[PDB]
Amino acid sequence: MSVGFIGAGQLAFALAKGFTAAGVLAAHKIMASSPDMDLATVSALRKMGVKLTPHNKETVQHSDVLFLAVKPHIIPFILDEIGADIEDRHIVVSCAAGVTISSIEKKLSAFRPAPRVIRCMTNTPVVVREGATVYATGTHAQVEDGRLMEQLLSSVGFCTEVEEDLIDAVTGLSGSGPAYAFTALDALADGGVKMGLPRRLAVRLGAQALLGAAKMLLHSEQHPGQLKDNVSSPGGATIHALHVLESGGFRSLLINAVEASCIRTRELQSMAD
Amino acid sequence: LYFQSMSVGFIGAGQLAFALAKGFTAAGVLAAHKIMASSPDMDLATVSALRKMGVKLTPHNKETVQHSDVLFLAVKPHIIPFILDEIGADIEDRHIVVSCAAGVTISSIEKKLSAFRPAPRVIRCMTNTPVVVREGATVYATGTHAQVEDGRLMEQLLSSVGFCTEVEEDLIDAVTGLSGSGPAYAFTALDALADGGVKMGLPRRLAVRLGAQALLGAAKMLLHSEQHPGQLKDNVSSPGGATIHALHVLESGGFRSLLINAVEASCIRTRELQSMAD
Amino acid sequence: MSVGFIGAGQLAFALAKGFTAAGVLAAHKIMASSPDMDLATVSALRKMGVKLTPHNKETVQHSDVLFLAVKPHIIPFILDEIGADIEDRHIVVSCAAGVTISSIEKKLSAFRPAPRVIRCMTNTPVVVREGATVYATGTHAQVEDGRLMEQLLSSVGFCTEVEEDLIDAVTGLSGSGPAYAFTALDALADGGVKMGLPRRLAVRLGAQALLGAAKMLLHSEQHPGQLKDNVSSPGGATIHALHVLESGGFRSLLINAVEASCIRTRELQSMAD
Amino acid sequence: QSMSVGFIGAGQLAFALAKGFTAAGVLAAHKIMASSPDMDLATVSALRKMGVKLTPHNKETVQHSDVLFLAVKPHIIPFILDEIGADIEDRHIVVSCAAGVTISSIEKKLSAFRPAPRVIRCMTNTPVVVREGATVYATGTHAQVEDGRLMEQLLSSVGFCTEVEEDLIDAVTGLSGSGPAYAFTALDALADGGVKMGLPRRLAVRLGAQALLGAAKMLLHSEQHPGQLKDNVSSPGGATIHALHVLESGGFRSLLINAVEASCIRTRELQSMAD
Amino acid sequence: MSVGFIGAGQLAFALAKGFTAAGVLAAHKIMASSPDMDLATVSALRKMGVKLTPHNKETVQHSDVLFLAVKPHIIPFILDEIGADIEDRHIVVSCAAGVTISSIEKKLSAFRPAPRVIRCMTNTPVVVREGATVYATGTHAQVEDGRLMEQLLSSVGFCTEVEEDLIDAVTGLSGSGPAYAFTALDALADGGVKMGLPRRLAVRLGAQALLGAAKMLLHSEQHPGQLKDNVSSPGGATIHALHVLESGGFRSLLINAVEASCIRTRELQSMAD
């Protein structure tokens, strides 16, 4: 099969890199179109063997599965330009936050009546094949379309189907999640440096700590609170550190973050059409 | 390149007219007698400094228009319906109208001016006070009838007094919150840093000089580096050392969030000032 | 003259880069010694033409002005190894925070009675010739030694003589200052991105704003509060933003920072000998 | 001169202005009449001993006066205007002091009786009682140029006075109108601090008040920024800069900004509930 | 009567300007000495008629009343330099914060047995003859020395005698008080600017409000809370603003400030008591 990306930003590069590393797609079977070719993300795709074109219509013509990896306010303008080029064979996969299946279908249906649309919510760690992806199937998506989507996106991380009304919440959790983690790792490294560690060692140790804890929880049947209890000895170093996290309302900040990202995603739809 | 040797007008003769006139003349791109400025008040301290530079001053806005090729405006959104109605009939084909006021849209200016002449050449500008030392930060957006050469002329002029680049107009409110109000954040920070130096035993004049030099050098480092500001911060902080201890107390007060709050508050206020126009 | 650096970290690279760019020293007249040659700072000095040796004694033998650009707990061990190699011609310039002139003189005087010692407090922007440096002259420094120091360090930024008892405070202000600025610029860029700017433009605009404001104050006779008053129009965008800075105690945080860095510098001496 | 002044209202403001005017020698007390619906006010007993004429009838105050101060609460202004509108004559200058009451609203109500009422809006404060007030005024549609000059001559005798555009007066209210209350609070607290550190209360109050007065006078007589004067008096490592740090840590500056804003906004709200 | 200042900083200028403006001293009967009088005060004192000398001993020889207006850590060095030049006629007035009478007397008594010492705490508004001054008389001060001190300092503001153990508290209140006021006036002006006033008008109105309020309290028999009650009408603008001051703990900040200045003054004791 052939896969196309409209918009060659970070997410286009990340998925192409993940897909080729997974070995589920050859790089030459992938075409990306970017309105800005000076992007550093575009310089790397050329080395991979991915095809680059400045014309979105060319990507549509080359592709069977069409990822719309552009910003939510750019989604409408793409559909106007390529709507006459959508054929029965196409599955249109929109990745932009907030942009609804209904809005995509309504725009494309002005050209052909039953566009096959899937909405996707993925994140940048697909580039190391540890992404987290959910998807929802549109009105005219055949049941085999969602199965195809899941097989493709499972090659670069976790993937599962959700009702479309959960995708804004997923955006606040696993969509924005990596940025919460990068912030946390920068700060944990600052803490290690304050207590005497070289910066490079501190970044390495903090990232390994987060990776290992996450893997433990994914492979465990236990509650995260039970795993937390297992780290701490009575009167020990860890429980003293957990107290100062609690005193600052650490948990509440992370709840605030998921909520703020989810709510903003809904506002990015309230300004669309 | 572009051969200038033209006439520039300012409607308004406050801090920005002074800053730009001082920057332009110091750059050697404009002679002071080619600049005219009009202010509704001739008792401003900026009046005296412009006179001594040799800039022409008038109480008559129409005179500034008749003098000028490039016309800078510095009037709030709720005073715009007054100035534009006063000078609209004096606008000629030669004029480029450059609006610098926050929250005044190109659409608003073009609509009012088109009542007099069909295709006014309008550019919207967002600059800051450090143009006075030729290190300003300026962005501009071109209007409907601006010729391509008008934008190039604007960029060449404002590049003589700092950084300048073209943006889409819908970014200008955000630029206002960042580099427009930015120098005020820096002056506040420099006052506080000097207070800290004085608390720890430094004479005030030395503390002001050291703090300002620290900020200038760090900003130049980032502009000349291809590294992330977090990497430059990492490079300065030895393990267990003085700097990382100081960075912790900044973090404990939410220092980063205050600066985000500031950019947001300035940007939002600029939008509220647009809502007061029409 | 010949200049040597014991310790090839960031500050050694920064001063060598600044000195050669200033044209006051040829790169081959500079020798640096590093106990860790895998440092990325050492990879760049070789390209400049600077001489690199693993042996501190070799740097002492090559040099007239000897910069001790190592950490404060490493200062004593260097003096033991090189003390027998110090000659009448040497000016020893210590850059480590907290390490006192008296402690350096006492260690070196076990070998030769009148070591010429200068204490320096500089910062990383010497690499772009906009550093801020203070220095204090030791017991046996000839008056021409401080004049020489000032001429050399003025080529890479501001430089002035201070009493040694001000250097801890200078460390908290201009020594750590650049890190306060890098933090501020990261956050201002985050604010610009939140309000819709691309990240690269936001970093550029914020850095130019800080550079221009700093230059204004350096070239002005006016108080920073007067320059602040000139930015704000009544009821305008800037004064609204200044209010939210004040509500968070912005000024107090920067005072806290200078104080915390200064106090820590004194503790780095209280643990020395 | 022959000028007669009237106060509709005999509260703190009428007393403060009458005391300041007579102390300044610009008005004899028998040329001042004040009316109030409540004669038991301690301010009325003090006006009586000053030699000011007191009457329960607002109409009598109007007939006596050339310059008529409306020194009453904002929600009372529209009631005074209906009662006295027919008694306004050509010679009258009506000076409204109520926060949030616009010139337009006063002119609209008085024009129902006579077409060109001479109206001035005033924002002054209580320190006029010691002739150190801070006053601004804006002139109305039919105010003659001599009316503003007369007003400024009168109010300059009891403090600072300058003309402003009317749209600045709500902000002035939050700054110099309410400002004396911010200062009284600050002086109470500074005295508490002096007492905590061992000073007798009476001495602490005197020293704090003298410190505030002298500092304000220094600023008014210097051409320097307040930040420069702050710099000039803070020696390195010294007691003052240590105290300034603890003010900054509490957001001292922001509290005062909050106060001016809150008073200004409330003045505008008082206008929204009128007419 | 001749008056001398050892020190030519802010305070010496303020007292000289106030004394000359009061007409209690001819300017030519005042001498001031400083090793580095780089301030424009050297030109202002000359235009004023004050005699200027770089030698502290010439000031002593010129003067009957000798003001020591230097920093607390500088006092012991002055007393060592001029101690042998003190005569029976001299009254030594120390203005330095925290420096005790007993420490000054012990220093000077090494030269002559009964030095006449007064300790003073004044503030900069003496420059506009509205200072706040307290003084304590030392062991050998003649009863007429205190009277002379009070007559002199009353010409430039409020002045009263206190027990010496109150002077550190006075320092935190009226000594540092003008700086609290300057900070407050800067912020009040910022508030006026936020609400639409031009900066120059905002500064003028805020300063006049403070001056008038302070004068009301000085001339009133009433408690400051009663004067506050008198200005706030029910439901009105002022009481709304006082609420937001209270919500921020405004009163406690000013208490904190007086306490912090007083405590720091107790730490500035240089010499042995």
Curated annotation (Swiss-Prot), chain D:
Q: What is this protein called?
A: Pyrroline-5-carboxylate reductase 1, mitochondrial
State what inhibits or activates this protein. Subject to competitive inhibition by the reaction product proline. Subject to competitive inhibition by stearoyl coenzyme A.
Q: One GO biological process from the UniProt record? A: negative regulation of oxidative stress-induced neuron intrinsic apoptotic signaling pathway
Keyword list, A-Z: Acetylation, Amino-acid biosynthesis, Disease variant, Mitochondrion, NADP, Oxidoreductase, Phosphoprotein, Proline biosynthesis, Stress response
Pfam families named in the record: F420_oxidored, P5CR_dimer
Q: What is the lineage of its organism?
A: Eukaryota, Metazoa, Chordata, Craniata, Vertebrata
| Residues binding NADP(+), per UniProt | 8-13, 36, 58, 71-74, 97-99
Q: What does this protein do?
A: Oxidoreductase that catalyzes the last step in proline biosynthesis, which corresponds to the reduction of pyrroline-5-carboxylate to L-proline using NAD(P)H. At physiologic concentrations, has higher specific activity in the presence of NADH. Involved in the cellular response to oxidative stress.
Q: Return the EC number.
A: 1.5.1.2
- What Gene3D superfamilies does this protein map onto? NAD(P)-binding Rossmann-like Domain (3.40.50.720), ProC C-terminal domain-like (1.10.3730.10)
What is one cellular component GO term in this UniProt entry?
A: mitochondrion
Gene Ontology molecular-function annotations: identical protein binding; pyrroline-5-carboxylate reductase activity
Q: What is the effect of changing residue 223 to A?
A: Reduced enzyme activity
